[PDB]
C-alpha cells in the first residue's frame, strides 16, 4: 500500500511540466495511423502509455509496485523495440527514464 503511494507520487512527476520537453511523446497512446506508422502494431504486441497508467493507477488497477514499474518499462521499451537506437523520440524516452528508474529505486523497501 505504501510502495503504491510512492508510485503515484513517481507517476506525477513523470506528468509535470519539469519534465515535458521529452516526457510529451509519452502522454497519450501512439497513434499509428495519424503518424503514418502501418506496422506499429505488427511490431508493438502491447502499447503502453503514461495515460493508461494514470487511469490504471486511479482505477487502483495496479496490485503492487512491481505491476506498475513492468508497465512504465513496457512504455520504454516499445519505445526502444520499435525505433533505431540514434531517433530522438529515443534519447527523449532515456531521459524520462532516468527520472522514472532514479525515484523507483528511492522506493521505500
Ligand atoms: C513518426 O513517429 C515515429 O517515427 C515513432 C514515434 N516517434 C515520435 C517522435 C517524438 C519526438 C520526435 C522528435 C523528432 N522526431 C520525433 C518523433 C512520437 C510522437 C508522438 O507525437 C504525439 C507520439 C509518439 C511518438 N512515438 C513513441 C512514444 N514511440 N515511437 C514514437
Redesign the pocket.
Given at each position: 500500500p505504501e510502495q503504491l503511494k510512492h508510485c503515484n507520487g513517481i507517476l506525477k512527476e513523470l506528468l509535470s511540466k519539469k519534465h515535458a520537453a521529452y516526457a510529451?511523446?509519452?502522454?497519450?497512446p501512439?497513434?499509428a495511423s495519424?503518424?503514418?506508422?502501418h506496422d506499429?502494431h505488427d511490431i508493438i504486441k502491447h502499447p503502453m502509455?503514461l495515460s493508461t497508467v494514470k487511469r490504471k493507477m486511479e482505477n487502483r488497477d495496479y496490485r503492487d509496485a512491481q505491476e506498475f514499474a513492468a508497465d512504465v518499462r513496457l512504455?520504454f521499451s516499445?519505445?526502444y523495440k520499435?525505433?533505431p537506437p540514434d531517433?530522438?523520440?529515443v534519447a527523449?524516452?532515456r531521459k524520462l527514464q532516468d527520472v522514472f528508474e532514479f525515484r523507483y529505486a528511492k522506493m521505500p523497501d
Amino acid at each position: 500500500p505504501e510502495q503504491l503511494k510512492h508510485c503515484n507520487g513517481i507517476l506525477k512527476e513523470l506528468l509535470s511540466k519539469k519534465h515535458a520537453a521529452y516526457a510529451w511523446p509519452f502522454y497519450k497512446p501512439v497513434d499509428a495511423s495519424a503518424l503514418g506508422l502501418h506496422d506499429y502494431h505488427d511490431i508493438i504486441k502491447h502499447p503502453m502509455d503514461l495515460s493508461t497508467v494514470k487511469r490504471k493507477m486511479e482505477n487502483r488497477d495496479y496490485r503492487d509496485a512491481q505491476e506498475f514499474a513492468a508497465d512504465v518499462r513496457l512504455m520504454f521499451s516499445n519505445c526502444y523495440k520499435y525505433n533505431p537506437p540514434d531517433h530522438d523520440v529515443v534519447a527523449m524516452a532515456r531521459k524520462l527514464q532516468d527520472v522514472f528508474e532514479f525515484r523507483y529505486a528511492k522506493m521505500p523497501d
